[PDB]
Write a protein that binds this ligand. Structure first.
Ligand SMILES: *[C@@H]1O[C@H](CO)[C@@H](O)[C@H](O)[C@H]1NC(C)=O
Ligand SMILES: *[C@@H]1O[C@H](CO)[C@@H](O)[C@H](O)[C@H]1NC(C)=O
Ligand SMILES: [Ca+2]
Ligand SMILES: [Ca+2]
Ligand code: NA
Length: 424
């Protein structure tokens, strides 16, 4: 009915055949078949190997198919040693890709809504005395996919919906009518930031990025009436002090609360707080919070140099950001708007060269911590120095400079007198 990305056949190059469960027992069949449930295996939780025809787990001496409740016996297998053990008790690879047996490990799958607070599915689990190796629509009404979060639903009755990878928003998302972006606020869940990351990824989505004041106010609008602190995609992890959105959105808009971010050492992940009234803080990525997901289904004059259908030049005369912009206008251009990493590397290495810092034209003059290119071009990417943009020591820093070897960006008071770069 559904897909099965993690099921594989277990194939011996010692013999020529792949493992199956026929009868009650397990043998090697040269008749390898991807379609036959007896031959196809899935790693499940607690180091167990589940066979789809038997709906049972490999066990041990000898080898057998046994119900997976029956933890007793062994049923515990480790993928590095699995081949050596088959050789001794009956070389081995996954069939057809010939890769090692650790290539399709068991991953946890976090549950949407239900009573389990987002807790991961327990695979396999018993419901109505049947065993299941994944999500089913059985026992439900509506048809939706759910699993148990306990290994016997009859006893504990702890369950939740399955993350779906969909190109639509049906039933689990709020849609902003104006932007057609979809959002999921999981308030019951308590997950670490990395588990939340994994959960939005499992739905074909990604953790919340707030790229603009509209998006922020829509978020506030959906949070009216709650008290809560949720994970967002904003995080410090990938390199320390430089903030990034989980999805690769440019950091174009900043809602940090007053005197955030703090604790640069172990507080690496952002949260949105109804308390702050939608303000942002950073926190320790290991605490368990609710969390938010989203998805949206003629070369030039002398002294200018070409890059990618545009022209660039250095203006060496030290001037305020505003006067620099005027000198660019007097030519055929505006201050340089930067939409590529390749473009930043050309600018920094070929043009900036030894000059330490110059104006680039990215500015929050119109609305604080909402950054714009002077030429009206969309801000599609940023590269900031760590802890920038800060409006430093609580002063207005309304204009952006490139600084230092790497070409990372700083916000600065605009009356500062520096060089600049233009493009047309
Ligand atoms: C697998 O076995 C079934 C038995 O019904 C057979 O019909 C099918 O053609 C086999 N698949 C392949 C790929 O040979
Ligand atoms: C920028 O303007 C402010 C306000 O008038 C002034 O206090 C400051 O000294 C100026 N800085 C420079 C570098 O001109
Ligand atoms: Ca500013
Ligand atoms: Ca600054
Ligand atoms: Na904090």
């Amino acid at each position: 009915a559904l897909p099965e990305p993690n099921i594989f056949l277990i194939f011996s190059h010692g013999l020529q055949g792949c493992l199956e469960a026929q009868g009650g027992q397990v043998r090697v069949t040269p008749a390898c078949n991807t379609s036959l449930p007896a031959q196809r295996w899935k790693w499940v939780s607690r180091n167990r190997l589940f066979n789809l025809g038997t709906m049972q787990c490999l066990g041990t001496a000898s080898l057998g198919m046994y119900e997976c409740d029956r933890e007793a016996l062994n049923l515990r297998w480790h993928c590095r040693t699995l081949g050596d053990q088959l050789s001794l008790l009956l070389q081995w690879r996954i069939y057809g890709s010939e890769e090692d047996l650790c290539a399709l490990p068991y991953h946890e799958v976090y549950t949407i809504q239900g009573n389990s607070h987002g807790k991961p599915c327990t695979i396999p689990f018993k419901y109505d005395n049947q065993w299941f190796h994944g999500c089913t629509s059985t026992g439900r009404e509506d048809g939706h996919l759910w699993c148990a979060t306990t290994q016997d639903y009859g006893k504990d009755e702890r369950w939740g919906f399955c993350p779906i990878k969909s190109n639509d928003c049906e039933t689990f998302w709020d849609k902003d009518q104006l932007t057609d972006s979809c959002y999921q606020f999981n308030f019951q869940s308590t997950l670490s930031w990395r588990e939340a990351w994994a959960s939005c990824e499992q739905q074909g989505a990604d953790l919340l990025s707030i790229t603009e004041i509209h998006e922020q106010t829509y978020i506030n609008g959906l949070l009216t009436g709650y008290s809560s602190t949720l994970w967002i995609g904003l995080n410090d992890l990938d390199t320390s002090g430089g903030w990034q959105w989980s999805d690769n959105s440019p950091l174009k808009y900043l809602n940090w609360e007053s005197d955030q971010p703090d604790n640069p050492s172990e507080e690496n992940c952002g949260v949105i707080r109804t308390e702050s009234s939608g303000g942002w803080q950073n926190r320790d990525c290991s605490i368990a919070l609710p969390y938010v997901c989203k998805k949206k289904p003629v070369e030039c004059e002398p002294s200018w140099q070409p890059f990618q259908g545009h022209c660039y030049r250095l203006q060496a005369e030290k001037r305020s950001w505003q006067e620099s912009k005027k000198a660019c206008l007097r030519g055929g251009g505006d201050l340089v708007s930067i939409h590529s990493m390749a473009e930043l590397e050309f600018i920094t290495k070929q043009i900036k060269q030894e000059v330490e810092e110059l104006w680039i034209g990215l500015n929050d003059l119109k609305l604080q911590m909402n950054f714009e290119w002077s030429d009206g071009s969309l801000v599609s990417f940023t590269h900031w120095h760590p802890f920038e943009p800060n409006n430093f020591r609580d002063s207005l820093e309304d204009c952006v400079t490139i600084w230092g070897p790497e070409g990372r960006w700083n916000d600065s008071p605009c009356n500062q007198s520096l060089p600049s770069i233009c493009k047309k």
